[PDB]
Amino acid sequence: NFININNLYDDNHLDWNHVLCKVNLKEQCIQIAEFYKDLSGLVQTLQTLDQNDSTTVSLYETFFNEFPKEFSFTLFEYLIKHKKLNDLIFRFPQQHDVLIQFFQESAPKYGHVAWIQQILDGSYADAMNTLKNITVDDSKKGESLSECELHLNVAKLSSLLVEKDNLDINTLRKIQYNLDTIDAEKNISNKLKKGEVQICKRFKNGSIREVFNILVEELKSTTVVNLSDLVELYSMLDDEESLFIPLRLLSVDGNLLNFEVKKFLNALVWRRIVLLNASNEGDKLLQHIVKRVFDEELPKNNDFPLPSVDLLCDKSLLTPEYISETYGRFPIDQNAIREEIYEEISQVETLNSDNSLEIKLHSTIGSVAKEKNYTINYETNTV
Amino acid sequence: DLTSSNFADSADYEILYEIRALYTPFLLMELHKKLVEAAKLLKIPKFISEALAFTSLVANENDKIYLLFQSSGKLKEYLDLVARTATLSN
């Protein structure tokens, strides 16, 4: 069964022996011009060295665009790779290849692997509308930093003045949504060079500060972000310049959350904070960050439980299968995080005796209620 | 309209849209007629780029001649003369 490796040699050295029937003398090369119903290599490399709009009156092709198993294999093999344009293997469109690709895209063969006319040709209408399929493959990332910036500034500036009608404004929206994740790394690279991050002296110990410390070390230099690791370093983050930034991610990237996973992320962060508030008296730590949850109007833009007693007293919310892979994406030990999260739970229940940690959640929402309607809940854990 | 800090009016915008549209691709197109009726293909009558070099020189976001330009109505008129610039070397 060495079939595939035989016929490797076969089509290779038919294409080689169809540019070797071109550096030989000629008369019976007519018997390639005429001469197929199956087995390609008669127009795959027999005009694919020059422009294909100068050979639409030639025998090689437009004679094989009616022979089956010849017609379909020319335009298939030319639209495999042309993508990334900020590379040494293609470089950018401006000359020869651009005008061939025009032909092969508005065609019975299809895009989403090439979009070269949908950045620059002339077209706005067919270009940016079919470009919309491609700007969910720039969902929280660029390809190159310099390439993503090129697609989006062209799609932005194209869509600044809408002249395929003027009502067709959808084409601005997700284009803006994607410019942020390259802008972020530029800004933050210079900012950690100055540096402003601070670390907790309570949870310094453990494998729980290693989600935080990695992200820091990656972001000294220009690096495309991951979002869920930010929610998951929450309660191990210190300083009051940032201590409220994944409240944003719960809202606007809570859309990228699945609406079942988001609940147990919330169960993790408020169970860490209740213990952290046992070493703070006054309950002021909780009081300021539950103010920011009420003045952005978090529970009324999406479902969101406010810290309360049930969401940290049950061990039916503990899901190990989730922890073994959201901290199984970094080189920390999987048991090390899982038994740490376990002992948070049994410390909530050892101090729900004499109402110790219970009253401290009750009085936090209960004092930021003298000027807002938000008050303690626990029959659903939502107001 | 190029900015929205100064005064603009919408009634008076649609008659920018369309008046632009009538003539700006003509001036563009008469550059491209000189390729095959004045035979000047570059800055010398040799070499045929500067029709193939113009296929994304028409595309610019610095003059924004891209956004008003039809994807079948002006683009088809444009490429048929490129295809006659190509047959000066066929």
On the 0-12 / 13-18 / 19+ scale of CB atoms within 10 A, A92 is middle
Residue with tokens 């197929």: A36
- Pairwise CB contact (< 8 Å): A166 & B70: no
Q: Of B14, B66, B75, which is closest to A158 when you measure between CB atoms? A: B66
Contact across the interface for A158 and B61, Cβ inside 8 Å: yes
Please state, as a whole number, how many other Cβ atoms lie within 10 Å of the Cβ of residue A271: 22
Query: Minimal Cα–Cα distance from A243 to chain B, Å?
Result: 37
The single residue listed with the structure tokens 């833009």 is: A301
- Inter-chain Cβ pairs, chain A and chain B, closer than 8 A: 85
Q: Where are the beta strands (DSSP E) in chain A?
A: 198-199, 237-238
Using the beta-carbon criterion (under 8 Å), do B71 and A120 form an inter-chain contact? no
Q: Which of B55, B68, B78 sits opposite A98 (nearest CB)?
A: B55
Task: Please tell me the distance from the alpha carbon of residue A152 to that of residue A145, in angstroms, as a whole number.
Answer: 11
Backbone angles phi, psi at A217, to 5 degrees: -75, -20
Tokens 């009085």 identify what position? Answer: A363
Of B53, B59, B87, which is closest to A122 when you measure between CB atoms? B59
The set of residues, in sequence order, having a beta carbon less than 8 Å from that of A268 and lying 6+ positions away, is: A232, A341
Neighbours of B66 (CB within 10 A): 23
How far apart CA B46 and CA B49 sit, in angstroms, is 9
d(CA A345, CA A314): 7
Cα–Cα distance for residue pair A219/A226, rounded to 1 Å:
11
Three-state SS letters, chain B: CCCCCCCCCCCCCHHHHHHHHHHHHHHHHHHHHHHHHCCCCCCCCCCCCCCCCCCCCCCCCCCCCCCCCCCCCCHHHHHHHHHHHHHHCC
Residue B13: list chain A partners with CB under 8 A.
166
Are A166 and B56 in contact (CB < 8 Å)? no
Best probe of the B interface among A53, A90, A153, A162, by most B CBs < 10 A, is A53
Q: If DSSP states are collapsed to H, E and C, what string results for A323-361?
A: HHHHCCCCCCCHHHHHHHHHHHHHHHHCCCHHHHHHHHH
User: What resolution does the deposited structure have, in angstroms?
Assistant: 11.6
Contacts of B14 in chain A (CB under 8 A): 166
Residue A302, Ramachandran bin (φ over 0: left; ψ between -120 and 50: alpha; else beta): beta
CB of B31 within 8 A of CB of B25?
no
Radius of gyration of chain B (CA): 16
Please give the residue of chain A at the shortest CA–CA distance from B77. A122
Minimum distance, in Å, between the CA of residue A100 and any CA atom of chain B: 10
Q: What angle do CA A105, A99, A50 make, to 5 degrees?
A: 110
Is B90 close to A54, i.e. CB distance below 8 A? yes
Neighbours of B33 (CB within 10 A): 11
